[PDB]
Amino acid sequence: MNIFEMLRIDEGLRLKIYKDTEGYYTIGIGHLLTKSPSLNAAKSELDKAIGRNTNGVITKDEAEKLFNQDVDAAVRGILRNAKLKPVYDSLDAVRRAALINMVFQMGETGVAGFTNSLRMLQQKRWDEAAVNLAKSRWYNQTPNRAKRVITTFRTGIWDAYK
Ligand SMILES: [Cl-]
Ligand SMILES: [Cl-]
């Protein structure tokens, strides 16, 4: 198991424009196209990301490319963020994946806002962090995915994904 397999599980794979849990236009493996309500605007964003006239449909390879870019970006975002970097540096490899997962889903800004949880993680207070993380809109809106991630922070192993 690794970050890619982990996210592929959490996000799934769709080759056609779709709406995410929040009702936003997305495609591939969790690749958000736009928060705007127009399907047109989404199609425009799609064509621009892929470099061609897609008509809202992409290939698996194209999806995978968008995915690698997105993973890369999340990592780099973590590394560039003053609040995140220190946490990420302090974690073991499996837990780092968990943090990356959160960033991929909610963005740098979003997770950097989990001040208290971040501190607990940094202190290696697993169980406490787990409870604090659960007190969130995130957990309440996407509970199954949140449990998976939370369990991964709590145990440091991949069992929630096996
Ligand atoms: Cl892009
Ligand atoms: Cl869920």
Side-chain angles (χ1 to χ4, degrees):
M1 178 87 42
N2 61 50
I3 184 59
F4 290 95
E5 310 184 8
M6 188 205 204
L7 282 165
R8 163 99 195 40
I9 279 158
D10 282 337
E11 304 283 351
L13 162 84
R14 293 244 245 160
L15 300 181
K16 152 97 201 318
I17 292 183
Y18 69 93
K19 276 201 208 169
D20 72 2
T21 63
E22 313 283 325
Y24 297 141
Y25 289 120
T26 304
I27 197 162
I29 302 157
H31 184 87
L32 195 238
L33 270 30
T34 178
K35 298 202 181 161
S36 135
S38 22
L39 181 163
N40 267 1
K43 279 167 161 206
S44 176
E45 284 305 307
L46 219 217
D47 290 332
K48 166 162 69 85
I50 300 297
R52 77 188 171 76
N53 286 119
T54 68
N55 201 35
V57 181
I58 59 173
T59 77
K60 170 177 235 275
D61 283 352
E62 282 165 338
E64 285 162 348
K65 189 167 189 180
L66 252 30
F67 185 42
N68 296 135
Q69 293 172 171
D70 291 343
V71 172
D72 205 20
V75 176
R76 255 244 172 81
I78 279 167
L79 259 14
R80 292 196 264 85
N81 183 300
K83 320 304 250 302
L84 302 173
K85 199 187 158 260
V87 185
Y88 182 87
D89 284 343
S90 76
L91 299 167
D92 58 90
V94 68
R95 299 183 172 88
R96 284 184 176 170
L99 182 64
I100 290 167
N101 195 304
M102 289 188 73
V103 176
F104 185 102
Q105 186 186 4
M106 76 195 21
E108 203 202 295
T109 329
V111 10
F114 278 60
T115 307
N116 302 319
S117 288
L118 261 13
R119 191 191 42 257
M120 286 156 207
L121 293 168
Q122 199 170 172
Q123 294 183 338
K124 311 201 171 280
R125 297 189 191 208
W126 314 130
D127 290 24
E128 301 168 39
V131 332
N132 187 262
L133 287 160
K135 303 189 193 162
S136 60
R137 173 187 192 265
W138 169 60
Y139 177 91
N140 285 285
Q141 300 290 318
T142 52
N144 288 142
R145 190 209 184 132
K147 355 260 257 242
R148 283 192 295 271
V149 176
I150 286 165
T151 294
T152 302
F153 277 125
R154 205 186 355 115
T155 59
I157 56 164
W158 290 110
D159 296 2
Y161 284 89
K162 292 149 97 85

